[PDB]
Design an enzyme around this catalytic site. Structure first.
Site, PDB file in Angstrom:
ATOM      1  CG  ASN A  94     -20.864 -46.554 -22.892  1.00 24.99           C
ATOM      2  OD1 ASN A  94     -21.229 -45.855 -24.166  1.00 24.99           O
ATOM      3  ND2 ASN A  94     -21.140 -47.406 -21.991  1.00 24.99           N
ATOM      4  N   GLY A 114     -22.427 -39.597 -22.352  1.00 31.23           N
ATOM      5  CA  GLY A 114     -23.494 -39.189 -23.677  1.00 31.23           C
ATOM      6  C   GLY A 114     -23.898 -38.449 -23.408  1.00 31.23           C
ATOM      7  CB  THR A 115     -25.031 -35.587 -25.343  1.00 34.13           C
ATOM      8  OG1 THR A 115     -23.883 -34.900 -25.502  1.00 34.13           O
ATOM      9  CG2 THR A 115     -25.878 -33.538 -25.354  1.00 34.13           C
ATOM     10  NE  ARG A 139     -36.209 -33.260 -23.664  1.00 34.38           N
ATOM     11  CZ  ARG A 139     -36.756 -33.984 -24.411  1.00 34.38           C
ATOM     12  NH1 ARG A 139     -37.054 -33.971 -26.118  1.00 34.38           N
ATOM     13  NH2 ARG A 139     -38.283 -34.577 -24.223  1.00 34.38           N
ATOM     14  CG  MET A 185     -31.844 -44.913 -29.718  1.00 36.50           C
ATOM     15  SD  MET A 185     -33.879 -43.822 -29.079  1.00 36.50           S
ATOM     16  CE  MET A 185     -35.307 -45.003 -29.743  1.00 36.50           C
ATOM     17  CG  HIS A 186     -29.804 -42.181 -27.044  1.00 37.66           C
ATOM     18  ND1 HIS A 186     -28.391 -41.613 -27.661  1.00 37.66           N
ATOM     19  CD2 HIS A 186     -30.395 -42.327 -27.193  1.00 37.66           C
ATOM     20  CE1 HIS A 186     -28.919 -41.301 -28.782  1.00 37.66           C
ATOM     21  NE2 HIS A 186     -30.132 -41.501 -28.421  1.00 37.66           N
ATOM     22  CD  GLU A 233     -18.815 -43.034 -25.126  1.00 34.38           C
ATOM     23  OE1 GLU A 233     -18.070 -43.722 -24.473  1.00 34.38           O
ATOM     24  OE2 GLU A 233     -19.783 -43.038 -25.213  1.00 34.38           O
ATOM     25  CD  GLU A 262     -34.536 -32.410 -28.682  1.00 32.48           C
ATOM     26  OE1 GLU A 262     -33.700 -33.093 -29.414  1.00 32.48           O
ATOM     27  OE2 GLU A 262     -34.734 -33.370 -27.610  1.00 32.48           O
TER      28      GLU A 262
HETATM   29 MG   LIG Z   1     -21.649 -44.729 -25.876  1.00 30.96          MG
HETATM   30 NA    NA Z   2     -18.970 -46.746 -23.447  1.00 27.79          NA
HETATM   31 NA    NA Z   3     -21.737 -41.466 -27.453  1.00 24.51          NA
END
Ligand SMILES: [Mg+2]
Ligand code: NA
Ligand code: NA
Ligand SMILES: [Cl-]
Ligand SMILES: [Cl-]
Ligand SMILES: [Mg+2]
Ligand code: NA
Ligand code: NA
Ligand code: NA
Ligand code: NA
Ligand SMILES: [Zn+2]
Ligand SMILES: [Zn+2]
EC number: 4.1.1.63
Lengths: 476, 67, 475, 67
Positions: free
Chosen positions: C161, C163-164, C166, C182-183, C225, C276
């Site tokens: 995975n 993702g972004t 900070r 939660m990510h 992604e 934020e």
């Molecule tokens: Mg993802």
């Molecule tokens: Na993934």
């Molecule tokens: Na993502």
């Protein structure tokens, strides 16, 4: 600020500003005058008033969408046709404070509305090109109309003389039906008369100064005369009124195109409606009052100022946009100076957004309480959103920010059952009776506890200058 | 001729076109429904009426007592 | 128009008048942030600003790359003035090409491998780090695509995975990452920390705008992604290369900088505070630390960072559509009645759904699905559901649906003790908020409705009268 | 012969026993109630029907508009 004495002066200005078009061809009234009104509002922006010169069966002409655009709304106030929404809102906020501006009573010979008199066999169709507004309407309606009634208990008190707008269904050559909704001023006076089985004198005016039509639809207090407000909106220039022929204590605008003098038949209800209303839906037929037309006064070559209404933001939604927000703002501000601005443009105030400073913890709910105890907001406003001082209640984008970041549904959303309602709202399950919802989208203030951080970020140091430096670099 | 909203035959002419023989207007007088001789109306089944619905229609505003 | 690196996109932005160059030297502290705030403050047609010279550093920086609808459209290869709903529909189409396997390339072919740093590691040598907001706890890396792999299934490319998150710089070679619970990254971190083993990680900076786009997109855990990037490029696979130190870890070939390292297990340090997207500072918490083991970067790297703060900064444009599209697709898979989903406002904490009501109360079921989706279960606090014919993106119409279709006795539902998002400053138990569902739909059987709520059909000639009026106005 | 559920006389024979003269089956055709000639049915007062109850009975599923 050019002030108008009759509807004709305003229409002339509308044409000079390119906000009025003439339909010179003859057109039968049924599907067309209604369609033209819908199309005019459907134009989106800079919507003009359309003037019909010839109607299939009738002698005279009609005008629709007179108020149906911000351009027309601005010219109504004597401002530049392109004056902004909030610019007009601030102009009304100023002239409003000139409230008591006694009108100018003139002799009968000086009133154009007294040029012609009809007292023998009465016929509305002779002078008014009656047409049907929406297909399933119960009959031909007179939507834009300023109705004058006086308090039977105090017929000499000029303050208790109230003029307002009510929908009128034509039911015969000389009788019509008026919707005397329970929460409006006319119902207070009708109750006093019907409690004694006495008729209520009434004067129905058509085709007036747009400011008169404006104040008619404005929810000011019972003890406030709308003619005195018109003089204030004309920046101190008093308006001209004349005494009714049949009834003293009844004063109508001098420059009206048509005046219908009559009385409400007491303790009698007949089948009125159905009628397409501003929520975009047909309102069901009910048993409503009947009015007997006793006499007609009108100017030679009268003009029928009617409007189309329906799926929202027709002409009526423009008319009610600011005349609903201004008095609600003033009424709140009298008790609570912390209020900044009030937005009640949406579906005639059934949804209201209030911007205010929070004096002490929970003050937002108190402002909502005042809004829900005002002549218009008590029966009308169902959803009341309160935002902080710095949020523009007219900017739904910002309101959406306040909802997402300042609302804790555990405490900030409050739902109150069995409160006064408006029957035209098709959501009220007990009709005319709805459950209120208050949303406190303000940042907490002591003594309301707040363990979280919620103060807004101060922009970085040079942001102000960098805005210019960026604009400058872009000019290449 | 019958009324398009309630089907009563107690319908009469209300007015003639002020100019020429353009059209006429008729009125029900049992439910007050009016229409022009040109427009052929078709009232939706939801908006039709009988003596029973007019009975329990609800009044606006309420009629006060007499004292 | 398909881009393989950030530089190609920047070239397009300049050709379209959506990029301006700050040729003068400028201090990093108050200026890069101010330029970012000012750029978004421009309102419309906001360009990206490119800093050529920074007081202490060698290389350059770029801010507000995604910060306007014009840039957003050029990202998709569309006309710079393509409308919002046009872009939304273009994403709805390319999305259905989902599995587009990326193209693996040799190490010599990847520009991100041009330079390697193995001895004494120093981020400041290559990255012009600056402070974003006044009270921020330090220098931050906002726009960054972070690559992690599942420790349990390190060979499953789907469970890789990106993702972004900070990243606060805490030393020459250590940074702090916000692994929110939660990510996706938190799922992989728990598996690693449960065995006291480090989690390999790759922090990329300055990528293809589509890569940055998908990083911030709330797709499922089992969806890679990179395969979505090929779909958004209309079938053109993107180029990836294997990380130097860690197999199973693949980074974009055209990245400006790649930071290969590992998350130190079972350790938390003082991260934040940090301004934020809700426009407020988020308080300091104990968050993970990352040790940088190796740096690969292109010669003359460019620092793609962003400013965020009082809403509709660059980040609000980035998250506007990448949040609404997957929510619409996730809902649409189970419920074909859904028309469109608007989740552009404060990162989806407010969502407006347009749907047909199959049977009575179906609106509440749609809201239930949104609140059981990867991004909406923890994020969406206020869910408004409107009819099929209401544009959920037209707040004017939504206000009409609220005023005419909402009976707060039944249509408003408030549910306590549901999953929440700590960044929302309203949550009283932080990270835990009470949900509110508003059913602004017209009642459908078997829900009783004694009232008449059907809409008026426009009068007969309105269509033609619209033309006749437009023509009469042309005089 | 009348219907045991609604009392209408618009009742007719539906089918004969396929084998012999065992029984017959009757149908109401005003409320669809069917019964066999052997079983003497006694409909509970709860389940009886008149023209009024059939009118406001409620449909499953709803009939959509026509387009
Ligand atoms: Mg993802
Ligand atoms: Na993934
Ligand atoms: Na993502
Ligand atoms: Cl109704
Ligand atoms: Cl906090
Ligand atoms: Mg009044
Ligand atoms: Na009034
Ligand atoms: Na008054
Ligand atoms: Na609050
Ligand atoms: Na509803
Ligand atoms: Zn009838
Ligand atoms: Zn039967």
């Amino acid at each position: 600020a050019k002030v108008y004495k009759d509807l004709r002066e305003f229409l002339e200005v509308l044409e000079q500003e390119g906000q009025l078009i003439r339909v010179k061809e003859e057109v039968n009234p049924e599907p067309d005058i209604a369609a033209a009104g819908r199309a005019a509002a459907n134009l989106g922006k800079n919507q003009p008033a359309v003037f019909f010169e010839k109607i299939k069966g009738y002698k005279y002409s009609v005008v629709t969408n007179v108020h149906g655009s911000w351009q027309n709304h601005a010219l109504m106030l004597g401002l530049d046709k392109n004056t902004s929404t909030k610019d007009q809102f601030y102009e009304l906020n100023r002239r409003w404070d000139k409230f008591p501006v006694p009108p100018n009573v003139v002799k009968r010979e000086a009133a154009p509305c007294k040029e012609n008199v009809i007292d023998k066999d009465i016929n509305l169709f002779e002078i008014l090109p009656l047409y049907r507004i929406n297909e399933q309407d119960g009959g031909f309606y007179i939507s834009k109309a300023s109705v004058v009634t006086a308090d039977p208990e105090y017929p000499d008190d000029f303050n208790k003389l109230n003029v307002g707008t009510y929908r009128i269904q034509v039911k015969d050559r000389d009788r019509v039906g008026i919707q005397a909704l329970a929460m409006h001023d006319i119902a207070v006076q009708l109750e006093k008369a019907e409690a004694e089985n006495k008729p209520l004198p009434i004067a129905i005016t058509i085709g007036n100064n747009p400011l008169v039509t404006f104040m008619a639809s404005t929810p000011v207090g019972y003890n406030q005369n709308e003619y005195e407000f018109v003089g204030a909106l004309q920046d101190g220039v008093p308006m001209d009124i004349v005494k009714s022929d049949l009834y003293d204590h009844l004063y109508v605008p001098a420059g009206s195109e048509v005046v219908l003098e009559g009385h409400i038949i007491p303790r009698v209800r007949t089948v009125e409606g159905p009628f397409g209303e501003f929520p975009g839906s047909y309102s069901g037929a009910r048993l409503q009052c009947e009015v007997k037309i006793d006499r007609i006064t009108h100017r030679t070559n009268p003009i029928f100022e009617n409007l189309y209404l329906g799926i929202p933001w027709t002409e009526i939604d423009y008319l009610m946009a600011l005349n609903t927000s201004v008095p609600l703002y003033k009424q709140l501000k009298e008790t609570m100076p912390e209020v900044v601005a009030v937005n009640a443009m949406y579906t005639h105030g059934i949804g209201v957004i209030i911007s205010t400073k929070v004096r002490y913890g929970g003050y937002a709910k108190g402002v909502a309480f005042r809004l829900l105890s005002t002549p218009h907001g008590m029966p009308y406003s169902k959803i009341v959103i309160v935002v902080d001082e710095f949020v523009d209640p007219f900017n739904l984008e910002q309101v959406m920010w306040a909802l997402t970041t300042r609302v804790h549904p555990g405490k900030d959303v409050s739902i109150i059952e069995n409160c006064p309602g408006m029957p035209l709202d098709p959501s009220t399950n007990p009709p005319g009776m709805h459950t209120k919802m208050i949303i406190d989208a303000t940042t907490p203030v002591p003594p309301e506890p707040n363990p979280r951080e919620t103060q807004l970020l101060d922009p970085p140091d040079g942001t102000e200058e960098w805005e210019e430096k960026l604009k400058e670099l872009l000019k290449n | 001729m019958k009324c398009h909203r309630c089907g009563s035959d107690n319908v009469r002419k209300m007015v003639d076109s002020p100019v020429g023989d353009a059209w006429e207007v008729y009125v029900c007088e049992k439910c007050c429904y009016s229409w022009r001789s040109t427009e052929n109306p078709v009232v939706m089944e939801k908006f039709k009426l009988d003596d029973n619905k007019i009975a329990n229609m609800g009044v606006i505003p309420p009629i006060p007592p007499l004292k």
